[PDB]
Every structure is written in C-alpha cells, then in structure tokens.
Amino acid sequence: REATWVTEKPLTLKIHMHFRDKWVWDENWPVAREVARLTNVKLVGVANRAATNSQEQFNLMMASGQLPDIVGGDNLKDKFIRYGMEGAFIPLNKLIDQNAPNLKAFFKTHPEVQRAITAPDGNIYYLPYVPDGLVSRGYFIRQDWLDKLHLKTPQTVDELYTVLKAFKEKDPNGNGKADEIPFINRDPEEVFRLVNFWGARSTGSNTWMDFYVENGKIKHPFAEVAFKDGIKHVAQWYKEGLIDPEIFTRKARSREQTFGNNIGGMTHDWFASTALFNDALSKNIPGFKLVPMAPPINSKGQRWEEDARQIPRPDGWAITATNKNPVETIKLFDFYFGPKGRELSNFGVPGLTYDIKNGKPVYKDTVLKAAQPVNNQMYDIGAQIPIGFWQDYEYERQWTNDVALQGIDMYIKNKYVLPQFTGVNLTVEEREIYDKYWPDVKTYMFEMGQSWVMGTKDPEKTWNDYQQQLKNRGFYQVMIVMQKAYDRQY
Numbered sequence: 001r002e003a004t005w006v007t008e009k010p011l012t013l014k015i016h017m018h019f020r021d022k023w024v025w026d027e028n029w030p031v032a033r034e035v036a037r038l039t040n041v042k043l044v045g046v047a048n049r050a051a052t053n054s055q056e057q058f059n060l061m062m063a064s065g066q067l068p069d070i071v072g073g074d075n076l077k078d079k080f081i082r083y084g085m086e087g088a089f090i091p092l093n094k095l096i097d098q099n100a101p102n103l104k105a106f107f108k109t110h111p112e113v114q115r116a117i118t119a120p121d122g123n124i125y126y127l128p129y130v131p132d133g134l135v136s137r138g139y140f141i142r143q144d145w146l147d148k149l150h151l152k153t154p155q156t157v158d159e160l161y162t163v164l165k166a167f168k169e170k171d172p173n174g175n176g177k178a179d180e181i182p183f184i185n186r187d188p189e190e191v192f193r194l195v196n197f198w199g200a201r202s203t204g205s206n207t208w209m210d211f212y213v214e215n216g217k218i219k220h221p222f223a224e225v226a227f228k229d230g231i232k233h234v235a236q237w238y239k240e241g242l243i244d245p246e247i248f249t250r251k252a253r254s255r256e257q258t259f260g261n262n263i264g265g266m267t268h269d270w271f272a273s274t275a276l277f278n279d280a281l282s283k284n285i286p287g288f289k290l291v292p293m294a295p296p297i298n299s300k301g302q303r304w305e306e307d308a309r310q311i312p313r314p315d316g317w318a319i320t321a322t323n324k325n326p327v328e329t330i331k332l333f334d335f336y337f338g339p340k341g342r343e344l345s346n347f348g349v350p351g352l353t354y355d356i357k358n359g360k361p362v363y364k365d366t367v368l369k370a371a372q373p374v375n376n377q378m379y380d381i382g383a384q385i386p387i388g389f390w391q392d393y394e395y396e397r398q399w400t401n402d403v404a405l406q407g408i409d410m411y412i413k414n415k416y417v418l419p420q421f422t423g424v425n426l427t428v429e430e431r432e433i434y435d436k437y438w439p440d441v442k443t444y445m446f447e448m449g450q451s452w453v454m455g456t457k458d459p460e461k462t463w464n465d466y467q468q469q470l471k472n473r474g475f476y477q478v479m480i481v482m483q484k485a486y487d488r489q490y
C-alpha cells in the first residue's frame with residue numbers, strides 16, 4: 001500500500017500505444033513498472049509490435065473491434081478530437097475538475113495549453129505531451145571538412161551549394177573514394193524544409209506540413225507558388241547528389257550511419273543529440289567537428305530557422321468509452337503531473353538511470369558518458385515517451401554539451417526562429433469539412449512532394465494538375481474554413 005495509490009484493489013488496463021513508427025508501450029519498462037507500483041495501476045499494451053506505421057495502427061485498432069481502455073501516441077490530436085466527438089473517447093473536463101488536482105492546477109496556469117487541446121464542442125479528449133524549452137533544431141556542418149578543404153562557413157545559399165558540391169567531389173575524408181553525402185537527415189520531411197533556402201515555407205510549426213499565417217491570411221506551404229519554384233531547386237540538389245539519395249528511406253539512425261562512417265557533411269536537427277556526436281565519435285574520427293551554423297541567407301535575403309519547440313505537441317493519450325474505470329484512469333494520469341510522476345516520466349527510475357543528490361534528479365555518469373543520446377536511452381525504459389506528460393528541460397540540460405549550448409544561445413540571441421503558427425479553433429461544422437478532406441489531402445501533398453524531389457515528376461509540368469487535384473480533393477474547402485476560424489479570432 002502506498003499514499004500515491006489511486007485505487008486499493010490492484011487495477012490493470014489495456015493500452016494501445018504505437019508511436020514514432022517503431023515503438024509500443026511495454027509494461028516491462030522500468031518506468032512503467034515503477035508507476036504501476038506507486039499507483040497500483042498496471043497498463044498492458046496491445047499494439048502490433050511488428051508495425052511500421054503508427055497512424056495505420058491507430059486506424060487498424062479503430063476497426064479491430066472492442067477498443068482498449070487507453071490510446072496514446074504521437075500526432076494523434078486530430079484523431080483524438082475527431083473520434084472523441086464521435087464518442088470513441090470520453091470528455092475529461094469533469095473528471096479533471098473533480099479528481100485531478102495536479103492537472104487542474106497545471107491548466108489554470110497554462111490557459112494556452114488547455115485551449116490548444118480543446119475540441120470544437122469545448123471538450124478535452126486527451127492529455128498532451130507538453131515539451132519544455134525554446135529552440136529545437138538548427139543547422140550543423142562539418143567544420144573539420146571545411147578546414148580540410150580550406151572553405152569558409154557558407155553565409156548564403158549559393159556559397160552553401162559550393163560547399164556541399166565540394167564535400168561531394170573533393171574527397172574530404174581523404175580515402176580516395178566518392179563516398180561523401182553532403183546533406184543527411186533522420187527526418188525525411190527535412191528535405192521539404194530545404195525550400196526555405198529559396199524563400200518558401202514547408203510548415204508553420206513543429207507539426208509537419210502545418211499551415212502558417214502571413215498578413216492575416218491562412219496559407220499552406222505545399223499549395224503556394226513559392227513551393228513550386230523552391231522544390232525545383234531541391235530536386236536539382238537531389239539530382240546532383242548533394243542531398244542524401246536515401247533521404248526518404250534512411251530515417252532514424254541516419255546520424256550514426258553517416259557521421260559514424262565519416263561520410264555525412266551537414267544536417268538540420270535538434271541541438272543536444274546532434275552535438276553529442278562530437279563526443280561519441282572523438283575516439284574513432286579524431287578531427288570530427290560537427291558545429292552549429294546560422295541558417296544561410298536565403299533568396300529572400302533572410303536567415304530562417306523555421307522550427308521551434310511546440311508547446312503543447314499534438315501528442316498524448318486519451319480514455320476510451322469502453323474504459324470501465326475512468327476515475328481511476330484520470331487519477332493515474334494526474335499522477336504524471338505531480339512532482340514524483342513528472343520526475344519519473346522525464347528521468348527514468350531512481351537508482352537506475354539517476355539518483356537524487358542535493359535533492360535534485362541527477363543522471364548517473366554511465367548514462368551521460370554513453371554513446372547513445374540521453375533521450376534515446378529514456379525511450380528504451382519508458383521515459384520521454386509521447387504520453388500525457390510535462391517535460392522538464394532540466395533533464396535535457398544535463399546532456400547538452402558546450403557545442404550545443406553555444407548553438408542554442410546563438411539562435412536565441414540572433415532571433416532566427418520564425419513566429420510559429422498557434423493554430424485556430426474550428427466550430428463543429430468547420431471541423432466536419434476539416435476531418436473529411438484534410439487527412440487525404442495531406443497524404444497526397446507528401447506523395448507529390450516526394451515525386452518532385454526525386455524527379456519522377458516535374459513540379460513545373462505538373463503544377464496545374466496538382467492544383468486541380470487539391471481542388472477536387474477539397475483542399476480549398478478546408479482553406480476557407482481555416483480562414484473563417486482565423487478571422488473569428490483576430
């Protein structure tokens with residue numbers, strides 16, 4: 001028996017949580033078992049472990065019969081809202097005010113967050129993953145390769161093109177082989193962000209292919225003429241091999257592969273984990289020096305850093321209408337917003353991954369000296385996972401080295417980060433159009449995007465057909481409701 005118990009008799013619930021296309025909830029996780037012990041509530045996963053698409057799995061579950069008790073994961077906000085209104089997920093407003101003091105307090109002081117997760121009917125259908133921090137990604141380039149080739153840090157897109165071209169043809173790793181890949185990225189979507197170099201947006205926030213606002217008008221990056229011209233340039237860089245040919249397939253371990261084998265020359269990724277490669281590779285590649293660099297001046301004469309930490313993220317978990325124990329569930333959820341629950345969800349297990357010293361959670365040296373970035377380590381034990389939790393930046397500071405810190409401070413000080421889209425609140429009627437067309441349009445945009453990048457389709461020759469399809473697929477119907485909602489507020 002524990003004072004943190006949310007129920008006297010032991011309670012086990014089923015959870016479907018497939019996330020980031022490669023992970024599933026594991027009751028075996030140290031963190032999970034630690035929370036079970038402290039709350040007397042144990043969660044058992046039911047997600048298909050051999051799945052490669054989390055979203056597909058959510059749909060599969062939505063059509064596999066009786067739903068589990070809890071559903072969680074990344075990029076589920078729209079599904080939580082859509083099916084929440086359909087009655088698949090229950091409203092949490094009441095449950096919170098009456099049984100979740102930690103959350104009621106959090107929302108009271110975080111009105112923007114509460115608004116961001118509220119549905120058109122005014123109901124809260126899930127608890128979000130709430131990131132902590134300001135900046136997210138930044139550009140990194142091989143300083144040792146620049147020095148080896150006697151090149152200066154590229155300040156413009158034209159200078160960058162010359163640098164990447166040199167990386168490709170001048171054998172910087174000096175093994176006499178043309179094995180260098182100028183630009184690499186673990187996120188395929190970052191290839192689309194390259195259009196920034198030519199004054200075109202790729203997304204309005206940390207949420208991929210999100211809308212943005214410009215002079216009181218809602219716009220979507222993939223529908224703009226600037227994207228047509230910008231993507232032509234990206235396609236060219238891809239054809240010339242300046243961009244990793246496996247950009248859409250490599251994914252997750254692109255850094256360990258390309259930097260580890262000394263063939264990657266530049267990327268655009270999160271500061272902390274990316275800078276760590278300098279420490280992880282120092283022994284094998286002596287001169288290895290991956291450093292942050294300001295965004296190059298684009299075709300519009302500006303240095304853009306389009307990405308920023310998003311608070312909250314469209315990630316989290318909800319309670320299904322089939323959950324026979326809703327009050328205990330919300331209490332379990334509330335535990336995560338208390339001091340001990342938040343600590344576990346961020347650092348892992350005390351005595352395992354960290355220890356309390358001077359009263360503060362302090363990571364063990366075995367974790368800090370590991371070859372694997374600290375967040376990857378947390379994922380392995382059930383921490384820093386996209387459930388409904390409040391991230392604590394202190395967990396990140398401990399493994400943010402001086403190189404990363406310098407880059408972070410440079411971006412903050414120089415204000416390269418573009419204003420982020422804070423979204424809009426649609427009425428039920430407006431949301432109906434949104435849920436009917438947006439999902440499929442988004443899918444189509446990505447597909448067209450890859451085709452343009454890989455040269456299987458010429459953006460110039462297919463633009464009119466593309467615009468016609470966006471129309472036929474209801475994209476402009478979605479755009480109109482978005483604009484009506486935007487004005488309804490500003």
Ligand SMILES: [Ca+2]
Pocket residue numbers: 171172173174175176177178179180
């Ligand atoms: Ca080489």
